[PDB]
């Protein structure tokens, strides 16, 4: 459909609303339409018209959102992709230990306003923490550019026009560009100057489409072999478009956790990322040092050698060295997650995995404790991308430690 | 929170400073941070963010520091723990007898530099009396290791890595370690080689985490039944890390009051510790010989038999014999105290308790005398851990005597 580019216009727009018979979108009458000529209540209900299937059982290809009629109450959104499953946003949690703890739902992930569904805009965060981009006009089309303009040529340069598009250009199978026509950026997400014309003001991107390269069957479980998404450069400067203060290359001067291309890894830190495999253990051997749950940039726009990585079978795990950068995604997840500020690990209560009664870990077994924070065991097995509580020590502690071996 | 280990990283660090809304620590702007990525003006204002409650009435669980807005002027810090209540440091005293006596405030206890509060570093003592560790970089994190590395296994060995942590390991309730994962050292205070990387120089610990075992409701009054903290071995060699000359095992050769594991108690001295209960009286009977105000080591790392002691009801008082050692704490108190060089008893003026007008003792009744040295009666009832002037004879003299029966 979007083959790196402007798909099929009618797939998202009706020029009238009569496809023979009667209307094409059941959110209006015969001859009216959505805000633009597209077909939905809002500019972001047109993508949920195909990326939210009706009755799913397990994670499939795309379909990064699972319905709420499906996950009855005490279950977990079923779409294990590297961005996340928006199903999370509508998931509140309560539990008592010595008071009334309550992890809200609208703090896990970006809220898109899809009033056609039960998607509401955020309340607490009226704007974006960094710069000021407004948070009631947060549609899929804000980060993603539906009419894929931004192209990668063969010299590696990026522009918004000049030759035809031929393919996605965002996989391992994706046939590299040639002298006659380019391919499309990592996801169709928009590069420099991509203000959507519906929005009106001064908010206009400034940094380029990042560099990265997905596996090509990116939506999977991770109990067995784990998914590895590659990460070229620029991936932080890009979120920097709508968060600005939070970017930080030089750490000591700017007191905030380093993130960017100007934030190298450290020869020492790097030694540690390998050594620390589990919690209490520091064996090492790069060949095994994973890349899922706390990944890292390679800092190299060479789509040939970096496509080198990005397999979906645990062959190239291949930790890092003091050249590797650390983008915002090494802690967070772009779409959403199960953890209060859309992180990848847990950071709410001292441990993550309790020791059952003997040894071998388990996430815990009582939904009104602090080990689980009101999240039944299946839930929190899906909060991580379906990896059992057996890839962690009986009393696994917090999980920055994959870098900072504070064990 | 610190369950023997690395608690909850975010509890002490912000990676940015925006927890939704606005900032998390009100000591900086939106997207800046403390010296390390933690949240406070200094590396030791992060622990006072939870161990100094706002308005307290009486001593509670932890909270070893009571605010100054609370104790108006003529009152006493309200935290009766076995380390002490830092509230003392900011307490000067004046009185006249035949001149102008003035017991300063910054001599009672270690000064931590918490510029975020009214905590200033020491002036008179620019370094530490023993070796040279500098006394403007004296943070809670200097003696205490926030990322609890040091573990006790089941063989009793101590290391800084190798198995997971499961619990504090520093109480009577604390479930002993097992073959799969260890517990944490007596307090999280750091063992061998624990230089904090902020500090830069040669100052690097050399001796191990001591051995001791607290009661498990350690913060209490003592008017009624008295708190007994147990004391394994090594407790002096440990303060020896930052004071070195002052350690002394063999007395006659090294002329300074004996202190350590190589400093036994004496069959004669030991006979005396029991006999002398009050000042003028020498009844004896070990079963009653206390252990609070002048305690002593047992010299035994056997966490089972030494946990045997350490109750908080006056059952095991159980004086000693010529094997018992004498650590630095048998005279001093680790955090602070009300007595000029942070001791446990008074050693300023001949007596401690005057005889009122009839007999039964009282600390005295006139704040400009020498009996009180400018410390109103309530004050000096809290200088001792709330024990009235009725556990002492009408004219109680100095208080080394619990060992040296110089009465
Ligand atoms: C509305 C604006 C959106 C947005 C923001 C995205 N989609 Fe689609 N999508 C569909 C299919 C079949 C695919 C796979 C086939 C193909 O891409 O040609 C995709 C893929 C994507 C991607 C990744 C593609 C890439 O190469 O980078 C992204 C980032 C994406 N989508 C976002 C199917 C549909 C639809 C079915 C008709 C509709 C409608 C949309 N998508 C709309 C959107
Ligand atoms: C096929 C060639 C077309 C053509 C001719 C157009 N589109 Fe679409 N379009 C989509 C969305 C979500 C928007 C909203 C953008 C926003 O909110 O800012 C639009 C917008 C337009 C416009 C107005 C804005 C502009 O910059 O031009 C126009 C003139 C336009 N489109 C024409 C979504 C989609 C699709 C979803 C996958 C697809 C396919 C297309 N558009 C294709 C076309
Ligand atoms: C690039 C991949 C990123 C990353 C890693 C994050 N963002 Fe966004 N963001 C935007 C708005 C309006 C908000 C407030 C809206 C809301 O709260 O739903 C946010 C918020 C966040 C958070 C906190 C989310 C929360 O629920 O509290 C986080 C952790 C986060 N962001 C990470 C708007 C935008 C953008 C506008 C175009 C862009 C681009 C990004 N964000 C990009 C990213
Ligand atoms: C999870 C919540 C955390 C937390 C609390 C911290 N980290 Fe890291 N970080 C990484 C690198 C390479 C650095 C280098 C800083 C430098 O060496 O100049 C940092 C920086 C820090 C600091 C600075 C402390 C210092 O000694 O300067 C602190 C306090 C800190 N972080 C806390 C890299 C990583 C990771 C790589 C994948 C991960 C994961 C984390 N950090 C996670 C966290
Ligand atoms: C900053 C570095 C510090 C330091 C040096 C200490 N704390 Fe805490 N503390 C908190 C709570 C609830 C407890 C009891 C619960 C538990 O320990 O799990 C403690 C306990 C301690 C101890 C004794 C613990 C032991 O088992 O030995 C010590 C030595 C100690 N603290 C020192 C609460 C907090 C906080 C609340 C968020 C914060 C922040 C800190 N403490 C920070 C520190
Ligand atoms: C959770 C797993 C983490 C991680 C990943 C880190 N910390 Fe902290 N930390 C605290 C304090 C007071 C300091 C200052 C130490 C000093 O002054 O020397 C630090 C320091 C760090 C660093 C830099 C120093 C180092 O040796 O690494 C790093 C990389 C780091 N931390 C990561 C205080 C605390 C806490 C207070 C109770 C808690 C909880 C954590 N840290 C947890 C973590
Ligand atoms: C282990 C439990 C001990 C004991 C029993 C004492 N210390 Fe310390 N000490 C350090 C520094 C820099 C000073 C000077 C700073 C200051 O004066 O505030 C001190 C001072 C003392 C004193 C005199 C205190 C006073 O106010 O005059 C006493 C009685 C004392 N110490 C006892 C530094 C350190 C350490 C650095 C890591 C460590 C460990 C200790 N001291 C340990 C202990
Ligand atoms: C409070 C200020 C004091 C003072 C001034 C003294 N003591 Fe004691 N000390 C203890 C033990 C077991 C010894 C053995 C020395 C030995 O027998 O070899 C000592 C040593 C001394 C001496 C040496 C005098 C001598 O005859 O060799 C002196 C002069 C001295 N101390 C003074 C044990 C204790 C305690 C056990 C809990 C306490 C309390 C004190 N001493 C307190 C003090
Ligand atoms: C001016 C008044 C008209 C009239 C009378 C019609 N057209 Fe359009 N139209 C366009 C496209 C792409 C379609 C079909 C696909 C789709 O909407 O997704 C249509 C459809 C119609 C119909 C079909 C009725 C039905 O099948 O339900 C009819 C009768 C019709 N039109 C008449 C596109 C355009 C267009 C630009 C692309 C313009 C300009 C017009 N239409 C104008 C008219
Ligand atoms: C609104 C409902 C949507 C829809 C349909 C999609 N997005 Fe996004 N998204 C963003 C980024 C940076 C990525 C790539 C990040 C990564 O690969 O880790 C994605 C990813 C996707 C995909 C495929 C990849 C995947 O799901 O892992 C798809 C199909 C997709 N998106 C569609 C960024 C944002 C964003 C803010 C930055 C917002 C809002 C959305 N996406 C919303 C939507
Ligand atoms: C690179 C520029 C970024 C950007 C744009 C964001 N992150 Fe982080 N961040 C981390 C953690 C644990 C939290 C929440 C909990 C806490 O701070 O105690 C956050 C928070 C955010 C927000 C929240 C704003 C708010 O809620 O007030 C936003 C918008 C945000 N981040 C964006 C952790 C990390 C991290 C390592 C753990 C790295 C690396 C980054 N962040 C990088 C970025
Ligand atoms: C700075 C503000 C702090 C904070 C928050 C704490 N400490 Fe210490 N402390 C030291 C030692 C040896 C002990 C144990 C001594 C004993 O048990 O007698 C303690 C004790 C504590 C506790 C609990 C036990 C208690 O309070 O009695 C807590 C919660 C605690 N500390 C926190 C040693 C030092 C030290 C120099 C050696 C310094 C400086 C601090 N502590 C400072 C702080
Ligand atoms: Mg939100
Ligand atoms: Mg002092």
Author numbering:
A (entry chain A), B (entry chain A): 26 to 432
Task: List passages from the publication reporting this PDB structure.
Determining their respective contributions has been complicated by the previously reported association of OmcS, a cytochrome known to participate in some forms of extracellular electron exchange, with conductive filaments. We conclude that these thick filaments are not simply associated with OmcS, but rather consist of OmcS monomers, thereby representing the first example, to our knowledge, of nanowires composed entirely of a bacterial cytochrome. The unexpected filamentous assembly of a c-type cytochrome in our structure suggests new possibilities for long-range biological electron transfer.
Individual filament segments were extracted from cryo-EM images of conductive e-pili preps and, after analysis, the resulting 3D reconstruction produced a map at 3.4 Å resolution with extensive contiguous polypeptide density that could not satisfactorily fit with any combination of PilA monomers and also showed multiple regions of density along the filament providing excellent fits to c-type heme molecules. In subsequent fitting attempts using the sequences of several related Geobacter cytochromes, only that of OmcS provided a near ideal fit to the density, incorporating the full OmcS sequence corresponding to the 47.5 Å filament repeat and accounting for all 6 hemes per OmcS monomer. Each monomer repeat extends ~4.8 nm along the fiber axis, is rotated 83° and is ~4 nm wide except at the intermonomer interfaces, where the fiber narrows substantially. At the core of the fiber is a continuous, unbranched stack of hemes. Successive hemes, approaching edge-to-edge, alternate between lying parallel and perpendicular to the previous heme. The interatomic contact distances are all ≤4.1 Å. The OmcS sequence includes six Cys-x-x-Cys-His motifs, with both Cys sulfur atoms covalently attached to heme substituents, and His as one of the axial ligands. All 12 heme-axial ligands are histidine side chains, with 11 coming from the same OmcS subunit, and 1 (attached to heme505) from a neighboring molecule. Notable exceptions, which are solvent-exposed edge-on, include heme502 (from one OmcS subunit) and heme506 (from the adjacent subunit), which are both located near the narrow, intersubunit interfaces (on opposite sides of the fiber). Each OmcS monomer also includes one octahedrally coordinated metal, tentatively identified as Mg++ based on its density level and experiment, whose biological significance is unclear.
